[PDB]
Write a protein that binds this DNA or RNA. Sequence first.
RNA 1: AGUAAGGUCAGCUAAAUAAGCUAUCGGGCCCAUACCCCGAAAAUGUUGGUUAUACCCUUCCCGUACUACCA
RNA 2: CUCGCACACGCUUACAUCAGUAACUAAUAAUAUACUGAUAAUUAACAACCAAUAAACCAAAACAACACUAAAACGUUUAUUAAUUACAUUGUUAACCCAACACAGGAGUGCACCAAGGAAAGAUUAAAAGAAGUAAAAGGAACUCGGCAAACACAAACCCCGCCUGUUUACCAAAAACAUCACCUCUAGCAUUACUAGUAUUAGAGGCAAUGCCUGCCCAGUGACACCAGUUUAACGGCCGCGGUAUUCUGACCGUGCAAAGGUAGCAUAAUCACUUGUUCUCCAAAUAAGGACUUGUAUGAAUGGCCACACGAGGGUUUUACUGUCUCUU
RNA 3: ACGAGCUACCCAUGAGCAGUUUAAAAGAACCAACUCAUCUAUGUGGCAAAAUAGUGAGAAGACUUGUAGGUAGAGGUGAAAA
Lengths: 46, 393, 240, 49
Amino acid sequence: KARGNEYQPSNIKRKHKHGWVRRLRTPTGVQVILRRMHKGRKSLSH
Amino acid sequence: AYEWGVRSTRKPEPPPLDRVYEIPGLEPITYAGKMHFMPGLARPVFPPWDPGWTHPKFRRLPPLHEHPLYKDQACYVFHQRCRLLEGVKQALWLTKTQLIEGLPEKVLRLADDPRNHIENQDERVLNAISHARLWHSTEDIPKRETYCPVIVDSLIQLCKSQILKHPSLARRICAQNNTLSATWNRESILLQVHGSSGARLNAKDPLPPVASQEEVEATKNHVLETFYPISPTMGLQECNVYDVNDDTGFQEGYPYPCPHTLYFLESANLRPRRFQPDQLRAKMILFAFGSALAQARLLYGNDSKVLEQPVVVQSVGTDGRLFQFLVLQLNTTDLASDEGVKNLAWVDSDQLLYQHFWCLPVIKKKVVVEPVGPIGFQPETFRKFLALYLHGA
Amino acid sequence: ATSVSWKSRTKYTVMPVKMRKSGGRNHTGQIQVHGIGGGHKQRYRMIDFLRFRPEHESKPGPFEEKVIAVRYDPCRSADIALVAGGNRKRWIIATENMKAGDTVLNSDHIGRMAVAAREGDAHPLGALPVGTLINNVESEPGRGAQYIRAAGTCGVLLRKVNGTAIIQLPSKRQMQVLETCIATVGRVSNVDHNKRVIGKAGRNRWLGKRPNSGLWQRKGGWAGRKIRPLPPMKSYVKLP
Amino acid sequence: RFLRRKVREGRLRQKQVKFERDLKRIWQKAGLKEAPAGWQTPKIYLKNQ
RNA sequence: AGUAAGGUCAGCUAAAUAAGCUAUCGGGCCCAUACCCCGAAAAUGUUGGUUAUACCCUUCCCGUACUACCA
RNA sequence: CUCGCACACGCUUACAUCAGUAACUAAUAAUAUACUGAUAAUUAACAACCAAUAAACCAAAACAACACUAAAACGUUUAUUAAUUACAUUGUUAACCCAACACAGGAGUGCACCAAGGAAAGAUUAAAAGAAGUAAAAGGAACUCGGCAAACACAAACCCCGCCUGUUUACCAAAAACAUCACCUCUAGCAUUACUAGUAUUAGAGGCAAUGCCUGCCCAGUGACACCAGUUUAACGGCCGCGGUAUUCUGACCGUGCAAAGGUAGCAUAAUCACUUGUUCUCCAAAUAAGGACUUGUAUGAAUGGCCACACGAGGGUUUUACUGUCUCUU
RNA sequence: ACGAGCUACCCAUGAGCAGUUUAAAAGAACCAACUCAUCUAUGUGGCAAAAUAGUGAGAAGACUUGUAGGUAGAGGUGAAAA
Ligand SMILES: [K+]
Ligand SMILES: [K+]
Ligand SMILES: [K+]
Ligand SMILES: [K+]
Ligand SMILES: [K+]
Ligand SMILES: [K+]
Ligand SMILES: [K+]
Ligand SMILES: [K+]
Ligand SMILES: [K+]
Ligand SMILES: [Mg+2]
Ligand SMILES: [Mg+2]
Ligand SMILES: [Mg+2]
Ligand SMILES: [Mg+2]
Ligand SMILES: [Mg+2]
Ligand SMILES: [Mg+2]
Ligand SMILES: [Mg+2]
Ligand SMILES: [Mg+2]
Ligand SMILES: [Mg+2]
Ligand SMILES: [Mg+2]
Ligand SMILES: [Mg+2]
Ligand SMILES: [Mg+2]
Ligand SMILES: [Mg+2]
Ligand SMILES: [Mg+2]
Ligand SMILES: [Mg+2]
Ligand SMILES: [Mg+2]
Ligand SMILES: [Mg+2]
Ligand SMILES: [Mg+2]
Ligand SMILES: [Mg+2]
Ligand SMILES: [Mg+2]
Ligand SMILES: [Mg+2]
Ligand SMILES: [Mg+2]
Ligand SMILES: [Mg+2]
Ligand SMILES: [Mg+2]
Ligand SMILES: [Mg+2]
Ligand SMILES: [Mg+2]
Ligand SMILES: [Mg+2]
Ligand SMILES: [Mg+2]
Ligand SMILES: [Mg+2]
Ligand SMILES: [Mg+2]
Ligand SMILES: [Mg+2]
Ligand SMILES: [Mg+2]
Ligand SMILES: [Mg+2]
Ligand SMILES: [Mg+2]
Ligand SMILES: [Mg+2]
Ligand SMILES: [Mg+2]
Ligand SMILES: [Mg+2]
Ligand SMILES: [Mg+2]
Ligand SMILES: [Mg+2]
Ligand SMILES: [Mg+2]
Ligand SMILES: [Mg+2]
Ligand SMILES: [Mg+2]
Ligand SMILES: [Mg+2]
Ligand SMILES: [Mg+2]
Ligand SMILES: [Mg+2]
Ligand SMILES: [Mg+2]
Ligand SMILES: [Mg+2]
Ligand SMILES: [Mg+2]
Ligand SMILES: [Mg+2]
Ligand SMILES: [Mg+2]
Ligand SMILES: [Mg+2]
Ligand SMILES: [Mg+2]
Ligand SMILES: [Mg+2]
Ligand SMILES: [Mg+2]
Ligand SMILES: [Mg+2]
Ligand SMILES: [Mg+2]
Ligand SMILES: [Mg+2]
Ligand SMILES: [Mg+2]
């Protein structure tokens, strides 16, 4: 009833959803890594 | 029929081989040279892995028939955790015994005499029950695996204190987790009692026979009860690897070669985990016979014959609230035939030591109805327990 | 993500096995059957449908077993009874009046004259009398019982012609089957399962049924009392 | 028919109420203040099976 | 207000080849009445225009009918 | 005056010692758990990491003695193998985390409610208005849409709609809406991922809402089935005019026409177009309110359900009793 | 393409419900922890992009709750509030 705190931290969930391993398991995920490498991002993924 | 496998759960079959392998006289091009997967190249087929030097942990398990003791004949093994359906009937059939209700006259007359009672027997046993179930643990509700061996050991100490009045109880000593094996042939099938026991008591001098010669002769005409739909073997473990060597728990020259009492404890929190009282009495019949049969063959020989000097082995089963008492006498070694002399076994069933215990005071309508302490007490159950312990002396 | 079905056990065992609910979700993860989920946790008992199954192939003759106990099975609406014989035990569906300490005969020998029909015995349809109530019907020889297993459901044999038996299913539909198929004589246990009354909405949730959707759908042309002639007899006999 | 249905139910309620007063008089004249514990007067003049 | 829409023997209907049933009038049958059988009479709401009329259109009159909503 | 110690999850040196704060950070000052610089620290017994196969075993947790229905997490032993060789690696601080903030918000478990943890007032004057709290003469709902709020009150009865507990529009509607036990209609004779390790007393696609008394008539149209005639309304839906007739009134009855049948039982000025503040009685000094009757409602009506009742309700309306600054009238 | 760490529902694995009234652990009753949010007053760039104070409903179940997994926009999910 008081929104604004939708982010509840959790390392298990964060590394399972946005981790480096998951990014390389799906063909669409690899393209996300390729786009960030081309753009010059400092952190490709969590 | 309806096989219990499921296609999805079962391991998938290997993928079909590439068409290149089907062409005779054509060497396929594989990616094994680059030792990594590459699309467009045929999948290599490798020979089964053959490590030059065998490694203990990481090698495949050897086949069962590779063991030197493997034998074609199927031998049946009865360990601690084997359940028998017709517990009293199957144990009687496999052992060739006759069930006699009530403890023997020697045991029962040894407890009714007031000259064989500990000081404050009623009071000390009452404290032993309270100590076992409420006092021995910091928690309010001790679990069964904690108070099942405590109550048995507490009662042993009570009857151990009688050594001052009878200076012959010093000939007894206890043994723990010994390896016992006894193999005998029973009507063209091979049985073996193998495993361990909870607690064992041994005495230097053998236990005198308890059955009169009148009862032994009457045992010849007794006919063992039979059950057609259920084979006697049901409930045992079928093992193809075994050794036909009756091995007791001790080597030669042991100063206590005569076992006296076996203590079986059913300690488990969950109801299905523990033995049923009918099945528990079966567990005592075979193990008491296994110890008895070991002496009957060590002291006389491997030849099968009727024993002129019987061997008597006692055993007590405990649940923590209900007790089982068994006295077994062995008379026959040639168990192949069912027409000879049968053995004897006196069994007292469901000797309730106490009805119920209240760890906390029950309160109904803001008043105390039943205070802390056991509800109902039957001293005769302990009195019989004391009788078995003093049977040797 | 693809899930794994809990039906992974390969060897038959009388002890209850662990069971995982589905909730109507297929292997993909989407809802396919609505109104299922959130039930009380249950364990599954391995039920041997094939009544005739010798312990060993050395002696293919008829064998007789003994009933130990009759228990309640959460999965099916009937009551299963533990049956032991030889060196193995089996869970089979109990008939109307099967109790502890009873003997059950399983046989397949198709005799010419007849065989007396008992309340628990299983005989091939070729040896049973014409007016016999049966359950656990085996559609094809060796396939196993598939039909008539609910509580209180019993089919009646009709006639045996040219070495082929015709039975009446509980849906009042005639079925044709070879006379060598094994069947069990009697009515399935828990006869008053239909007369059970659910006292509250919560008991439905305990069973494992979720409430229906609240969308109000106007009735179409499918509704209304439909009178339709009985479909023709379903035959599993392959005519050469 | 439905006029008699209303009256029959109306007379039954008065029959039950008058029965309650008779039981209520018994314990009040006996000296008690409340009806004996565990005693709930049943509705005898109620449709059952 | 607007729109829609109808009138036919005393009555109600179908056709415009103005018919059918009933009512009404006369006679027969019966002790008398009714039923029944026989015979006769009877009308196109109104004005005008529709080759000329009628079913149509128009005028007059009676009565019927729907709608009158967003702020 | 009282949300205190510790673990898990999270945050990541913000913690500790010493020194400095003209200025940066604290919404101010003193000052330093919060700003700057240097130096220093959490030491494993607790916690993470921490064998495989075959076989025996139908028998619940609730002080569990023994039982209930919804049928229930929680394993031992035997056999065959398992590198055998002090000291391995890793988490140990904190006044902290998610909400743009040093935010009156959000936050799981164990044990206490304290022995522990904290400060409502920066200094004054004591105007109006506003917010919160206490008390009051005589009167006790005369206030007002409503007794909203407040009260030394903390009770009694009637009606309407839903049976009931429950559920929903996170952030203007918590209800009379949805769900629900019950009843009924409909579709399916069956195997390895749903339904289901099930098999018509089963399982799906829906309607209507317990119980009790009932659920009338209509397959012409549409839809469905049969896939032909036809069969189905607890399938969508429907369930009539004109004229005359017993002194008068009313219309049992009669003539005539159209329909697949012509609204049956019941209830009723209702939450039910308008007429409408229908008429009448009771309640009040006074009644467009409330309850009970009369009743063509020409637009009520029978599982798009009619009707009656117990219990229940932070729903909607009325009455009595008790209380009170709601109000006469404010202090 | 990326999102079910909030929320709707489900699958795993855990953890809570003290006292009081009754043969009752009965979707019973009184009342806390706990969970929802009925009514009114403050607040309206506020302490808060939905809160505080008083008062309320449930409180052994169709109940609350932690960890983690599943369903993704022509869809998911829904005791239909679009
Ligand atoms: K069942
Ligand atoms: K931090
Ligand atoms: K008013
Ligand atoms: K509510
Ligand atoms: K039709
Ligand atoms: K009224
Ligand atoms: K309500
Ligand atoms: K997820
Ligand atoms: K706040
Ligand atoms: Mg955000
Ligand atoms: Mg969360
Ligand atoms: Mg099921
Ligand atoms: Mg339904
Ligand atoms: Mg509905
Ligand atoms: Mg931060
Ligand atoms: Mg400060
Ligand atoms: Mg300093
Ligand atoms: Mg610092
Ligand atoms: Mg702020
Ligand atoms: Mg202050
Ligand atoms: Mg100030
Ligand atoms: Mg002021
Ligand atoms: Mg004031
Ligand atoms: Mg006051
Ligand atoms: Mg006053
Ligand atoms: Mg007034
Ligand atoms: Mg006024
Ligand atoms: Mg209002
Ligand atoms: Mg109020
Ligand atoms: Mg009203
Ligand atoms: Mg309700
Ligand atoms: Mg009602
Ligand atoms: Mg409610
Ligand atoms: Mg809302
Ligand atoms: Mg609200
Ligand atoms: Mg009915
Ligand atoms: Mg009803
Ligand atoms: Mg409803
Ligand atoms: Mg309704
Ligand atoms: Mg109807
Ligand atoms: Mg038709
Ligand atoms: Mg009326
Ligand atoms: Mg009404
Ligand atoms: Mg009206
Ligand atoms: Mg009003
Ligand atoms: Mg008023
Ligand atoms: Mg009225
Ligand atoms: Mg109507
Ligand atoms: Mg309908
Ligand atoms: Mg209606
Ligand atoms: Mg009720
Ligand atoms: Mg009310
Ligand atoms: Mg008053
Ligand atoms: Mg989630
Ligand atoms: Mg309680
Ligand atoms: Mg309750
Ligand atoms: Mg909510
Ligand atoms: Mg509040
Ligand atoms: Mg408040
Ligand atoms: Mg107040
Ligand atoms: Mg309450
Ligand atoms: Mg309540
Ligand atoms: Mg995705
Ligand atoms: Mg959609
Ligand atoms: Mg919901
Ligand atoms: Mg709606
Ligand atoms: Mg809408």
